[PDB]
């Protein structure tokens, strides 16, 4: 009684609306539920903040069994009414039931098996699931409104499969390549970079501390600055043996933050692991060498301590972002005048029949790409260093503590290309066809774009977004 065909037996089996496709594998499942994930940066790698209300719904039969086991509820109906009123002992029973009972957290595009991990629930107020920061890389989850589905293992065998097999502290290496998948992402690496990064003349230069404890006590009382090159006495333990762990103490030259951070590194790791700036790859390699020396328990502990200290010293960093942090180079309009002169000369030669049309197009596209490279190079050489004084009193160049640059150079977020678009010029823009519009964007974002350049950028922007929206459709083919 429509325009569409009727569905038949062969249709009742085949097709994605058939039985095999999405009723024989993809099924709706009980003891489950989803919510909106938040950070919860205090958790450990093995736990997730479960809301009290989701936890009281999923673990309902377990709670009923507890109330009737402990006598707090005469029959299952009385327990039902208790946990319906949400009395005062249903909460103690929740704490007891949940105690060692993992929950599977899963996010929608399960591209790999790390899009499912067993976590121990930590009951929290509110209605958002709190997901560990170092797990977002596996989940591909940011905290701008994503949601997660929690499932509850029901059997002892599934409880032991979650604990023994899928627990978040077991899966830390990418199954595609054994590099650890617990790399700290953006506030963490910026914390560890800011603290592990010296400057030429800070408070307390060239003190000889007694060790990392004294460097921390000095910094926290504010007598020394977090990057003030001091001689510090370091005892590092090297398993250079049949696993014997010989100790060796010496006097290194490190910043105060280098030594404050040495307090968290476990025994088997050398001291050169923290004695440099510690951007992003430095931290991933730090976790990796800790794993190749010490194994899994020290590496999980190390990862948690790294996240904690990175977040703490990044908050103490006070690393904001301003408008004066986009240092547009002064030689930008000189370079653009020279490039504009070159395109005017090439257009004059083309008008005189010396070149063809497409030939001159190629020439001008090349001129603009080259001038864009000079502007980007000039701006990054302006941004990547700064002058400072000094023990004896003379000016001395050190790496810049500019904030946009510190974020791009610590590996925390950003890179010199987006930096170029922020303070250097924007460059030439594509079209959806792949052709290149030969009228460049000589402006940046610290300046503005006018209506025409903001229109021209829209071409490549909409093309990129239209592709990323459709790649999302067939993400897992």
């Amino acid at each position: 009684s429509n325009k569409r065909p009727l569905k038949s037996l062969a249709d009742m089996i085949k097709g994605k609306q058939g039985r095999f496709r999405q009723n024989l594998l993809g099924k709706r499942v009980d003891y489950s539920g989803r919510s909106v994930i938040t950070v919860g940066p205090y958790l450990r790698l093995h736990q997730c903040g479960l809301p009290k209300k989701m936890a009281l719904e999923l673990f309902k039969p377990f709670i009923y069994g507890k109330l009737e086991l402990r006598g707090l509820a005469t029959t299952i109906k009385a327990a039902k009414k208790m946990v319906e009123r949400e009395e005062a002992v249903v909460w103690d029973i929740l704490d007891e039931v949940i105690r060692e009972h993992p929950v599977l957290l899963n996010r929608a595009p399960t591209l790999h098996r790390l899009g499912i991990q067993a976590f121990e629930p930590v009951l929290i107020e509110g209605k958002a699931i709190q997901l560990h920061p170092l797990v977002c890389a596996a989940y591909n989850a940011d905290f701008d409104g994503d949601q997660m589905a929690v499932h509850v293992p029901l059997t002892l065998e599934a409880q032991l499969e979650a604990r023994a097999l899928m627990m978040s502290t077991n899966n830390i290496l990418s199954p595609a390549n054994g590099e650890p998948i617990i790399v700290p992402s953006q506030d963490v690496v910026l914390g560890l970079y800011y603290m592990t990064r010296d400057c030429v003349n800070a408070k307390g230069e060239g003190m000889v501390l007694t060790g990392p404890k004294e460097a921390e006590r000095l910094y926290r009382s504010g007598l020394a600055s977090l990057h003030a090159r001091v001689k510090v006495r370091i005892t590092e333990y090297e398993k250079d043996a049949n696993g014997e762990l010989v100790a060796k103490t010496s006097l290194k030259d490190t910043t105060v933050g280098r030594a404050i951070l040495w307090m968290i590194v476990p025994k088997g790791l050398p001291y050169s692991i923290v004695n440099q700036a510690l951007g992003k790859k430095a931290i991933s390699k730090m976790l990796n060498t800790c794993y190749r020396i010490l194994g899994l328990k020290p590496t999980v502990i190390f990862a948690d301590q790294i996240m904690y200290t990175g977040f703490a010293y990044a908050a103490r960093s006070g690393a904001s972002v301003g408008i004066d942090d986009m240092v547009i180079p002064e030689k930008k309009h000189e370079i653009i005048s020279e490039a504009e002169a070159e395109v005017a000369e090439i257009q004059e030669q083309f008008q005189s029949g010396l070149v063809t049309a497409g030939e001159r197009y190629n020439k001008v596209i090349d001129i603009w790409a080259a001038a864009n490279d000079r502007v980007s190079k000039a701006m990054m050489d302006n941004l990547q260093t700064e002058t400072v004084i000094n023990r004896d009193g003379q000016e001395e160049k050190q790496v810049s503590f500019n904030s946009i640059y510190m974020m791009a150079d610590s590996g925390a977020r950003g890179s010199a290309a987006q930096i170029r678009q922020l303070a250097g010029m924007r460059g030439l823009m594509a079209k959806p066809d792949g052709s290149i519009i030969e009228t460049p964007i000589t402006a940046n974002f610290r300046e503005g774009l006018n209506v025409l350049q903001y229109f021209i950028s829209t071409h490549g922007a909409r093309k990129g977004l239209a592709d990323t929206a459709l790649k999302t459709a067939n993400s897992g083919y």
């Binding site: 940011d142 090349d366 594509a430």
Partner: protein
């Protein structure tokens, strides 16, 4: 991911691959050929100073550009 960061990567790849194609078509460093490979004519001095390493005069070049405009 944010759905605009991946869009950024796509746009970056698109513009870069276009820019470098149109750059490779220039072949600035080259050989002094001094005479057209189509009509043997004298490639005038200015065209060899602008484009070091041309192989066609402007007439044969524009001719070839028309055809390669359509295709084949």
């Amino acid at each position: 991911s944010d759905e605009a960061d991946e869009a950024y990567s796509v746009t970056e790849q698109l513009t870069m691959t276009g820019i470098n194609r149109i750059r490779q078509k220039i072949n600035a460093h080259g050989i002094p050929v001094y005479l057209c490979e189509a009509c043997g004519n004298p490639i005038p001095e200015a065209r060899r100073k602008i484009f070091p390493g041309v192989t066609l005069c402007v007439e044969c070049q524009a001719y070839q550009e028309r055809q390669r405009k359509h295709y084949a």
